[PDB]
Write a protein that binds this DNA or RNA. Structure first.
Ligand SMILES: Nc1ccn([C@H]2C[C@H](O)[C@@H](COP(=O)(O)C(F)(F)P(=O)(O)OP(=O)(O)O)O2)c(=O)n1
Ligand SMILES: [Mg+2]
Length: 321
DNA sequence: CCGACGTCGCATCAGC
DNA sequence: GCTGATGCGA
DNA sequence: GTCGG
């Protein structure tokens, strides 16, 4: 809303930095600028006005001015029309093709999906799956399908061993009406910090033809593809699903962290610091009088975490910030 | 001025 | 063959 | 690219 022309511009600049110039920190700077401007509840009229916001500096101020006085950025217009740069940027939309792989492909004349299709031999396993489901991976998932997906996942996990605890986290857990993928956090009492749990779950999901492809799989993280059964109806798009096995004594921290939002974890993180706490994905530890965290504390639900920091439970419904 | 800017699991590469 | 580095996505 | 030490 409000400054979509500006934030589209900035996001576009961000992508070229990451994908073409391989400048991760500029990618991040542009996205911060785009994010702070997106939340600005006013129609921006000058670069100076924008510069007042944290993350918007002299150069972005200048870019805004040019956009506001012409309706575009010369550099961006040039970048878009550059065959090499535009191709490198495009190829990274394929899961598994990052900035480096895109650059190599474009160097050797491989620039479109058709070219990718023509050169399967030059693609690793992940990249082939990314190519296979290029279109599907870019679709969002309606909440109703996410629930249908949740039904299958919770049912099959409990079927393998009823002592598993499984939680669908991510935007879905925050009640969002659509998701980009499904994230499943999994634990089991026989698995602690101190102490084939994941393989067995993946195998069951494959057995009932829910999981269709594997991108990567180790003892704690699975990254793959799944698909709901089809009704005389259109088949469902294939969807990205992740499954993480976490020790029970870190599980609820993990659930918090992987539920988001990113901005919420930000805000909640600093609060821990104020009251002398370093919360990371895994644990919560107290900062001694020097900057020295001690042991991780007991955590046996999300709330235990809120309590250590004298917060009251925020239902995931409102963890947008 | 100049460095920081977030982190990790898995797949694959580079070097030995 | 092994160990550490790099690429990648989240 | 922007920030801050
Ligand atoms: N650079 C990154 C990016 C992400 N993540 C982790 C940390 C996040 O908890 C997790 C998902 O971030 P997400 O990018 O899918 C999102 F924020 F858009 P979400 O709202 O969760 O969308 P959805 O629920 O539909 O998948 O990836 C990370 O660790 N590093
Ligand atoms: Mg996601």
């Amino acid at each position: 809303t409000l400054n979509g022309g500006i934030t589209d511009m900035l996001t576009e600049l961000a992508n070229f930095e990451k994908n073409v110039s391989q400048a991760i920190h500029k990618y991040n700077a542009y996205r911060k600028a785009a994010s702070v401007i997106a939340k600005y509840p006013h129609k921006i009229k000058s670069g100076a006005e924008a510069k007042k916001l944290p993350g918007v500096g002299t150069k972005i101020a200048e870019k805004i001015d040019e956009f506001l006085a012409t309706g575009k950025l010369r550099k961006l217009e040039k970048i878009r029309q550059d065959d090499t740069s535009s191709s490198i940027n495009f190829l990274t939309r394929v899961s598994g093709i990052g900035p480096s792989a895109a650059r190599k492909f474009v160097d050797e004349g491989i620039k479109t999906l058709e070219d990718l299709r023509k050169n399967e031999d030059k693609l690793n396993h992940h990249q082939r799956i990314g190519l296979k489901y290029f279109g599907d991976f870019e679709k969002r998932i309606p909440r109703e399908e996410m629930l249908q997906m949740q039904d299958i996942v919770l049912n099959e996990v409990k079927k393998v061993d009823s002592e598993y605890i499984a939680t669908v986290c991510g935007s879905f857990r925050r009640g969002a009406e659509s998701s980009g993928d499904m994230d499943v956090l999994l634990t089991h009492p026989s698995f602690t910090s101190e102490s084939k749990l994941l393989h067995q779950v993946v195998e069951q999901l494959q057995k009932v033809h829910f999981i269709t492809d594997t991108l990567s799989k180790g003892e704690t993280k699975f990254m793959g593809v799944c698909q709901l059964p089809s009704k005389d109806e259109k088949e469902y798009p294939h969807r990205r699903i992740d499954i993480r096995l976490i020790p029970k004594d870190q599980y609820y921290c993990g659930v918090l962290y992987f539920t988001g939002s990113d901005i919420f974890n930000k805000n909640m993180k600093a609060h821990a610091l104020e009251k002398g706490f370093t919360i990371n994905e895994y644990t919560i530890r107290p900062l001694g009088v020097t900057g020295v965290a001690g042991e991780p504390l007991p955590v046996d639900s999300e709330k235990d975490i809120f309590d250590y920091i004298q917060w009251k439970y925020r239902e995931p419904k409102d963890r947008s910030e």
